[PDB]
């Protein structure tokens with residue numbers, strides 16, 4: 001009966017995992033998992049939504065990450081009479097259990113969610129969270145934009161800290177353009193980048209041509225880790241696995 005639009009790759013992946021695949025009629029740009037979701041219509045990007053694109057799908061329920069903007073579009077969609085359910089957007093490993101809970105409560109699959117939660121906690125718990133003296137620089141590369149580093153108050157910065165590592169970039173929030181001096185002062189031991197960032201750059205050649213990268217301990221030892229964009233930053237079900245790659249790569253640097 002329900003025509004569900006899910007917004008937020010984390011939300012979508014959880015809805016699908018709670019067995020609602022059949023009822024989801026559309027989703028946002030950040031939602032690309034599972035692949036089944038890639039075949040659904042794209043209503044736009046979570047951070048720049050427009051009401052018309054969502055309402056054209058005639059949803060009965062909108063499951064939306066709190067990270068969604070502009071907020072008044074949700075108000076507007078709710079006034080039109082669709083059930084708008086908000087999902088917590090904290091970039092924290094403990095936050096995922098909260099996300100699963102809100103989604104399940106909304107789908108009336110409380111028990112299914114409870115099960116999914118235990119599996120996530122069981123997978124998360126297996127990861128060594130002991131702090132390690134390794135500094136990490138996360139870089140986001142587009143095709144047509146200057147490369148950018150993550151400060152604090154980012155998912156990337158939370159991910160790094162949760163793996164037991166340290167954010168090489170300090171003293172600022174969100175993202176900033178790379179500069180040779182900035183990067184070099186950062187002195188990362190490990191360069192963290194996304195799968196798409198790699199494609200945007202070309203080859204490993206261009207990777208170490210990033211401003212100042214070669215003049216860092218990371219660039220000297222070619223210490224690199226490439227992870228799926230949303231797996232790394234989405235704080236959904238794949239969080240434990242990504243923390244594992246990151247932890248392993250750090251431990252292996254002793």
Ligand code: HEM
Nearest residue numbers: 029030045047150153154155156157174175229230233234
């Ligand atoms: C017009 C298109 C886009 C614009 C203008 C844009 C802009 C931004 C900006 C400025 C930030 C960080 C600053 C802030 O949060 O205020 C950000 C974060 C992020 N973006 Fe977008 N973006 C776009 C498209 C996309 C798409 C298509 C994806 C699909 C995966 C995406 C995924 C993310 C994620 C996962 C973050 C969180 C990073 C973190 O917390 O470390 N973005 N985006």
Ligand code: HEM
Nearest residue numbers: 139140142143144145148150174175176194196229230233
């Ligand atoms: C940090 C993680 C981020 C991710 C995973 C991400 C992801 C994406 C993706 C998938 C696109 C679509 C690419 C395209 O259409 O060419 C995009 C576009 C865009 N992003 Fe990001 N983004 C991030 C951060 C940022 C930040 C911090 C900014 C700050 C300016 C930004 C600015 C933009 C802009 C202006 C576009 C639109 C380009 C166009 O329309 O041609 N993004 N982003």
